Amino acid sequence: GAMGSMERASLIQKAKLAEQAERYEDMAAFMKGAVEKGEELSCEERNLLSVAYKNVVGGQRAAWRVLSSIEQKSNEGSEEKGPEVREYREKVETELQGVCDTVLGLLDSHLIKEAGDAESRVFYLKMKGDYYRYLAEVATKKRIIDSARSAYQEAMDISKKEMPPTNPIRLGLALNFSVFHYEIANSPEEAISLAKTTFDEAMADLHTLSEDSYKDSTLIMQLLRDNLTLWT
């Protein structure tokens, strides 16, 4: 693609510049180019990839929700305004699906299969679950939901065997899987149970951590607690 002529290190450098400039579409394109060089990604590089695409799809998801809400209102004594709301919601939806398909394609070709360490494999499987979850949010679907579930479950199984309960990757995975249960899978009790158990097992392991690791873990634990407060 268009990044084929740029050095891997230059793509990484420019991804960091793009982040500083809040140019997340550029950041994602640079990181896609870096992945396509075919080498494995370091921890920092994995995080750049994740930040870039999370910001891109996050803006698409927010736009899609605005347009979907307008579309649902039009379908209630509502005056007919023609096909335009549906058309434009479909346009944004198709672009969102394209970004998800792009990320899933990078994971399948070939990030996941080359990821042998727990930290990398769990990271990528969580990403797979997340981007299938974003596809599920707009799907009208059972197979997409099962694909998200399967990726999250494999990541959970590895994380429980290979990582301590305070590990930020493990915590963020559990957080997002709990959101999947609550918002996608119609399983609020599973969401609540997962969030509670994750929080409590992390609490009990905080004593092993340095000041900096304690800050990292407790930040994510607070999101679990915020959700539990919303859900109960």
Partner: peptide, 8 residues
């Protein structure tokens, strides 16, 4: 309203 992992 549910919070997922931060974009960062």
């Amino acid at each position: 309203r549910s919070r997922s992992s931060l974009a960062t």
